[PDB]
From a paper:
different crystal forms to high resolution (up to 1.5 Å). Mep2 channel closure is likely due to movements of the CTR and ICL1 and ICL3. twin-His motif via hydrogen bonding with a highly conserved tyrosine hydroxyl group. the region beyond Ser457 is disordered. should facilitate the phosphorylation by Npr1. that the crystallization process favours closed states of the Mep2 channels. do show that Mep2 proteins can assume different conformations.
structures of the Mep2 transceptors from S. cerevisiae and C. albicans. function as ammonium receptors/sensors in fungal development. a central channel for the transport of ammonium. non-phosphorylated, with channels that are closed on the cytoplasmic side.
Author numbering:
A (entry chain A), B (entry chain A), C (entry chain A): 1 to 455
Write the structure that this text describes.
C-alpha cells in the first residue's frame, strides 16, 4: 500500500512488486558467489596461523576458525549488521533498527547495485574473517568460553564502529574522502592493531621463542601454512573482486591486481629472506609475502592501475618482513604475526592507495573519485593517514580496554595468569582430567582447556 | 521444422533458434556455479565420516568419495536423471525417455528458469552427495566391487523414486503440497534411514566401541572432520542457495538462513556437550552441530523468515545430540552417525518447515505457497509428516531388501560374515597378500579388501 | 575523442562511454567465476604429483604450486599475455604491444563476449596450471632459483607460441580449422611432451624405482593424491565450462561432459588395474583415471555429444594406463607421470575430437564448425593430427634446448650432476648447513636446496 519501491525498509511489498526488478541479476550473482569465496577465507586464516606458529598452541586454529564462523554469524545477525548498515546512523555508528535482521530484504543497500539481504550476506563474511584473525592473534593459552564472549564483544564495539566509519552511509571516513576499496581498515589494519594490544598486554614476555639466538621461522606445520595460503588467495578474488558490488569489468580488473600483488609479494619476501639468510630459500617467507601483497592491495585493488599493483606486493612484503623482526626486539611472539602482516601490511597498503589511486580506474564502472597523487590530488594522502591513524587508535585502545576488563573478572579472564594455571602433564595424572594426556588435537575429542590450579 | 521453442524434447533446433533466449543468463550462471559448489560436498562427506569414526575403517572415505562421484555420475547419465526428470512420468517414477541423456538440452526443466542440461548437471550433484552418504554409512568392512554395484542399484530404486516424488513434474508429494526446499527428503532423510537399515542388518552388534563405559566421541581424525565440515558448509551455499533455480534475492535469503542455522547448530551442540560432560569443550560436537543445522535448514531455507533459522540450528542440534546416544542403547556403531545427523536431522527439519514456512518468504521470487503455521495453514504439518514417513518407510524397507538380497549372493555380498573373513595380520604372512602388512591407507597403493578365508 | 567503442586498444574512454555496455554481464560473471576455479587447479596439480611420487622429492610440490602461481602471474603480466593475445600478431606469435598489460581493458577480446581484462585474468590461469605441470615434471633434485628462471623462459618461448597458434587471432591452427575446446594443446599436450624432454635429458637413468621387479604404484601420500584430484575436478568445471567464453547452455553441456569423462576415466583405469593385478583395487589408479578423462575431454568438451564423453574417459584411461608402463621399459621415473597423463592423454583426446565433434553441439551457443567424423567431415582428423604433432615437436625440441643450455651454465643448471651434489646427511654434519638434518618439509622453514660439493 502501495507497496511500491521505496528504497527503505523491506524495499516494497512482495505481494505487489518484484523487488528483484531494482537490480541487475548478474551483479547479484557475482556478489553471491563472492560471498561464498570470502567464507572459505575463514578456515584459510585458521590454517595459516596454526601452521606458522613457533609455539605449540593448545587450541587448534583450523578448528577455531569454525568456532569463529559460528560466533561471527550469530553476532552479525543479532546486531552487527545493524550497527554497520542501518540506513539511519550517525557519523560514528549505526543503530538497532535491523536487530535480528528485521526488515533486511530488498531495499538497495548502501551499495545500490545489490539488495540489503545480499549485502548482509557478503559483509557478514568480512566480519567473520576479522573474527578468526582476532581469535588467531589471541589464541595462546586462550580459554574457549571467554574467547567466544570476547569475540562477540570485540565485533560489537571494535569492528562495527570502524566498519561504519568506512562503509556506513554517513560514516565519517566516507565523507572525508578516504579510500578503502575492500575494507583494509575494518579487516586488516583493525585486526592487526587489536593483535598488538593482545601482544603487549596478554602476550608472554621474554618468550623463549623470541629471545636471543633463535630462528625467525620455525613453523608448526608447513602443509597448514600452504593450505591456508591457498584458501586465502582463492577466496580473496571474492574479497577484492566483490568489493565493486557489481558484475562490471572493474571487478575483473581488481582480480588481476589481486593476483599480481600476491605473486609479487610472495617472490619479494622470499628474495628478501634469500639475501638476509645468505642464500636460503624460505618456505614460510613465500607464503607470508603472498599474504602481505594480498593485504597491501586490499584498500587499492579497484582504484590503482594494473602496473602499480606490483608495488603493492613489493613494498608491503619488504616492510612486513622487517616488522616481523620487532618480535626479537620486544621478545614477544604471541599475537605479533597478525600485527605484522595485517596491521603493518594494512597501514602500508592504505598509505600507498593515496599515492596510486586513479580516477580513470575507478571510472571503469562509473565510480567517481578525485584520485590520488596519480591525479595530482595531493590531499588524498592526508585522508588516508587520517583513516589509518583512527583505525589503529580505536582498535588498539578499545581492544586493550576489553582484554583488561575481562582479565579482572575471574570467569571472563581470557588467558589465565601463569601462576594459576595447571600443567597438562599434571592434569593427566588426575582421574577427572585424564584426557589431558592426549596433547594432540588430531585425536582428542576435547579442547585442552586451561584449568585453574585452585580446583 | 519449425524447430521453434516447444518446451519439450531438445527444446528446439539449434540451427533455427537460440535456445538460450528462453532463460535469464544470470539464473543460469548461478545454477552452474551452485552445481560446482555441490560437487565439493562429495569429498566433504567422505572427510567428515572418515574423521568422526570411532573405528579403524579399512576403506578410506576421503578416497571413496571419489569412487562415489564416479559411480553416481555414471548412474545419473545412464538412467538416474531420466527416472527423476523425464517430463512424462507417473506419480511415483519417471521413465527411460532420457536414457543416456538422450534429448537433454534446452527445453525448460521442471524448474522453468533453467534448461534441462543445466538442471541435469545440478541435480546430478545431489545424487552424488547422497551416494557418498550411503557409502559412508555402509563402509565398515565393505567390499569395493559389491559396494559399487550396491550404490548403482540403490540410486536407481531408492534415491530416484524418492526424488521423483519430491521434484518430479507429477510427483505425489509435490501435488500434495508438502514443502522441501532443497531436497532434504531425497538426500538427508533418505540416506539417514537407509543408513539405519544398514546398522540394523549388517552393522556389528555388541560393538566394543558402543558397549558399556565408552567415550561418545573418539575420532579417527579431527583434521579430517574439520576439513569435511569446511567443504560441506562452503558447498551448502550452492546446495541451498541454488534450490530456487534462479538469481533472485530469495537465493541470497536462503544463504543467510543456511549460514545462521549452521552457526547456531554448531554452538548449540557444543553447549549441550558442555552441560552433559560437566564442562568439557567438544571438538567433534561443534562440527556435528553445524552439520545438524545445515541438514535442518535444508527443507526450509527458502521458505522461513530469517529469525526462525536459528531454531533450525538449535532444535536439530539438541535432538540429534541425543539421537547419537541410541548407539549406546543398541550397542551398534556402524551406520549410526549418518542416521543420527541426516535421518533424524532431516525428519526434524522437515517437520519444522510445516511450522515456520511463510508465504511472504516464498514470494520473494514469486513462488506461490499456502505457507505453514506462520500463515495459520495448520494442515501443512500433516503434509510434512506424510512426506517424512513415506521417505523413511521406502528408504528403510527397500534398502533392507537390497542389502539382504546381495548378502545371499556370494559375489555380491557387501560385507563378509565375520567367520568367513581372514585377518589382515594373517593375510600379510602370505606371499600373494603381503601388501596387507601396510594397514595405513596413506601409503598403500591398494584397498585392503576383505578376503574370504576359503582361498 | 570521440572515445566511443573502437574494438581496439582500451576499447574506449571511460569518461565518455561505459565499456561494460559491450558485454552481457552474465557472460562476464561466469568467466570471472571460472577464473577463480582454474586458479585452485594450480595447487591441485602440486598435490597430485607430490602424492603420486614413488621417490622422496626434496622439493614439496604442494608448496611449489604457490611458487609457480607467483612466477606465472608475473610472466603473464610482463609479456606472456601480450605474446598470446596482442590483437596484432603474425601466424606464429603475438607482440609486446601489451607489455606490462598496457592498454588491456575493455575492448572485446578474441573471445568477443568478454573484455580483454577478463580474458587476461582467465587465460593467465591456464598459463599458471601449465607452469606447475612443468615444475612438477622437473622437480626431482631441482634447484629453486634455476627452476624459477626456467619457468619464466619456458612460458615465454614454449607455452606462449603454442597458445598463440591455438587461440591467437591469426594463430595458424585456428586458421587451419583444428579443434581444441579448452586448450588441451597449450596446457596438457605441451606440458606432457616438455615433461618427456625432461625425462630423457635430465631424468635419472636405470632408476631403482623403475628397474626390474618393482611396484607400478608406490605413492608418497594417498591423501595428497586425493586432495589434488578433488581440487582438479572441482576447478575443471571452470577450465572446461569457461572455455565457451559465455553464460550459454553450451557451458553447462561442457560441464556435464567433463564430469562424465572424469567418472568413466576413473572407473576404467581402476577396472584395468583390477584385471592386470589379478583382482586388486588400485587407490592411485582411480585418481589417475579421473585425470586421464579430464585431460581427454578438454579439447572436446564443448564439441562432442554427451553420450560420446564416456569414450573420452574410457579410451584415454586405457591408453594412459599402458603408457605408464613405458617407465619400466626405459627405467626412468622422473617426469614420466606428467608425460603419460598430460602428453598421451592430451594427444588421444585431441585425436578423438576429430572423430566425435559435432556441428549441432557447437551450435548450442551459435559457434560455427564443420564438425568431425560425426558430420562426415573426414579431413578434420588430419587437422587434429597436424596440431598434435606441431605441439609435441615444438614443446619437446625447445624444452630440450632450454634444459641443455641452462645445464651448461653453472649458475643456471636446474639439476646438479650426481657427482657434484653433496648428500643431505653430510651437509647436516656441517654447522652452516645443520638444517639439512630436518629432511621433512612439514617442519623445515627452508627448502632443502641441492648444494655443490665444491663449497
Ligand atoms: C539484549 C539487547 C536487547 C536489544 C533488543 C531491542 O531492539 C530494539 O528493536 C527495534 C527494532 O526491532 C529497534 O528499533 C530498537 O532500536 C531496538 O532497541
Ligand atoms: C538464541 C537466539 C536468539 C535470537 C532469536 C530471537 C530473535 C528475536 C526476533 O524477534 C522477532 O522479530 C520479528 C521481526 O519481524 C517479529 O515479527 C517477531 O514477532 C519477533 O519474535
Ligand atoms: C556463548 C557463551 C558460552 C559461555 C560463555 C560464558 C563465559 C565463559 C564460560 O566458560 C568457562 O570456562 C571454564 C574453563 O576455563 C569452564 O571450566 C567453565 O565451564 C566455564 O565457566
Ligand atoms: C580514535 C577514533 C577517532 C575517530 C573520530 C575522529 C574523526 C571525527 C570526524 O568527525 C566528523
Ligand atoms: C540394460 C538396460 C537397457 C535399457 C535401454 C532401453 O532404453 C530405451 O531408450 C528409449 C529412448 O532412448 C526410451 O524411450 C525407452 O523407454 C527405453 O526402453
Ligand atoms: C560403458 C558406457 C556405456 C554408455 C555409452 C553408450 C550410450 C548409448 C546411447 O546410444 C546412442 O544414443 C544416441 C541418442 O542421440 C543415438 O543417436 C546413438 O545412435 C546411440 O548410439
Ligand atoms: C562396476 C562394477 C565392478 C565389478 C562389480 C562386480 C561385482 C563385485 C566384484 O568384485 C569382487 O570383489 C572380490 C573381493 O571381495 C574380488 O576378489 C573379486 O575380484 C570380485 O569378484
Ligand atoms: C511407502 C511409500 C508410500 C508412497 C505412496 C503413498 C502415497 C500415495 C499417494 O498417491 C496419490
Ligand atoms: C627487458 C625487455 C624490455 C622490453 C620492454 C619494451 O616494450 C615495448 O613496449 C611497447 C608498448 O609498451 C611496445 O609497443 C613495444 O613493442 C615494446 O618493445
Ligand atoms: C619488478 C617488476 C617490474 C614491473 C613493473 C614495471 C612496469 C613498467 C610499465 O611502465 C609503465 O606503463 C604505463 C602504461 O600506461 C606508463 O603510462 C607508465 O609511464 C610506465 O611507468
Ligand atoms: C626470480 C629469480 C631469482 C634468482 C634466480 C637467479 C638464478 C638462480 C640463482 O639461485 C642460485 O641457487 C643456488 C643454490 O643452488 C644458491 O646457492 C645461490 O644463492 C643462487 O645463485
Ligand atoms: C614444429 C612447429 C611447426 C609449426 C609451424 C608448422 C605449420 C605452419 C603453417 O603455416 C601457415
Amino acid at each position: 500500500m502501495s507497496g511500491q519501491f521505496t528504497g527503505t525498509g523491506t524495499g516494497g511489498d512482495v505481494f505487489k512488486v518484484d523487488l528483484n526488478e531494482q537490480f541487475d541479476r548478474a551483479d547479484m550473482v557475482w556478489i553471491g558467489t563472492a560471498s561464498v569465496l570470502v567464507w572459505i577465507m575463514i578456515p584459510g586464516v585458521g590454517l595459516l596461523y596454526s601452521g606458522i606458529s613457533r609455539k605449540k598452541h593448545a587450541l587448534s586454529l583450523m578448528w577455531a576458525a569454525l568456532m569463529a564462523a559460528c560466533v561471527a554469524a550469530f553476532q552479525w545477525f543479532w546486531w552487527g549488521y545493524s550497527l554497520v548498515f542501518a540506513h539511519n546512523g550517525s557519523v560514528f555508528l549505526g543503530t538497532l533498527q535491523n536487530f535480528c535482521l528485521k526488515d533486511v530484504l530488498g531495499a538497495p543497500s548502501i551499495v545500490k547495485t545489490v539488495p540489503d539481504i545480499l549485502f548482509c550476506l557478503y559483509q557478514g563474511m568480512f566480519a567473520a574473517v576479522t573474527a578468526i584473525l582476532m581469535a588467531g592473534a589471541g589464541c595462546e593459552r586462550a580459554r574457549l568460553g571467554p574467547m567466544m564472549v570476547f569475540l562477540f564483544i570485540w565485533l560489537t564495539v571494535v569492528y562495527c564502529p570502524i566498519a561504519y566509519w568506512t562503509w556506513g552511509g554517513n560514516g565519517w571516513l566516507v565523507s572525508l574522502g578516504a579510500l578503502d576499496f575492500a575494507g583494509g581498515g575494518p579487516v586488516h589494519e583493525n585486526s592487526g592493531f587489536a593483535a598488538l594490544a593482545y601482544s603487549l598486554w596478554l602476550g608472554k614476555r621474554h618468550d623463549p621463542v623470541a629471545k636471543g639466538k633463535v630462528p625467525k621461522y620455525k613453523p608448526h606445520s608447513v602443509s597448514s601454512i600452504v593450505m591456508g595460503t591457498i584458501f586465502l588467495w582463492f577466496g580473496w578474488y571474492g574479497f577484492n573482486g566483490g568489493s565493486t558490488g557489481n558484475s562490471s569489468m572493474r571487478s575483473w580488473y581488481a582480480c588481476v591486481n589481486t593476483n599480481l600483488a600476491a605473486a609479487t609479494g610472495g617472490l619479494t619476501w622470499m628474495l628478501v629472506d634469500w639475501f638476509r639468510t645468505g642464500g636460503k630459500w624460505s618456505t614460510v617467507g613465500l607464503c607470508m609475502g603472498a599474504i602481505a601483497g594480498l593485504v597491501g592491495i586490499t584498500p587499492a585493488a579497484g582504484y590503482v592501475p594494473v602496473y602499480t599493483s606490483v608495488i603493492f606486493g613489493i613494498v608491503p612484503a619488504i616492510i612486513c618482513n622487517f616488522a616481523v623482526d620487532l618480535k626479537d626486539l620486544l621478545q614477544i611472539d604471541d599475537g605479533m604475526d597478525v600485527w605484522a602482516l595485517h596491521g603493518v601490511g594494512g597501514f602500508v597498503g592504505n598509505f600507498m592507495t593515496g599515492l596510486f589511486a586513479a580516477d580513470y580506474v575507478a571510472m571503469i564502472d562509473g565510480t567517481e573519485i578525485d584520485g590520488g597523487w596519480m591525479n595530482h590530488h595531493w590531499k588524498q594522502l592526508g585522508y588516508q593517514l587520517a583513516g589509518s591513524c583512527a583505525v589503529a587508535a580505536w582498535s588498539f585502545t578499545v581492544t586493550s580496554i576489553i582484554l583488561l576488563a575481562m582479565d579482572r573478572i575471574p570467569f571472563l579472564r581470557i588467558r589465565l595468569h601463569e601462576d594459576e594455571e595447571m600443567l597438562g602433564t599434571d592434569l593427566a595424572q588426575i582421574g577427572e582430567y585424564a584426557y589431558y594426556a592426549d596433547d594432540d588435537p588430531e585425536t582428542n575429542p576435547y579442547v585442552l582447556e586451561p584449568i585453574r590450579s585452585t580446583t
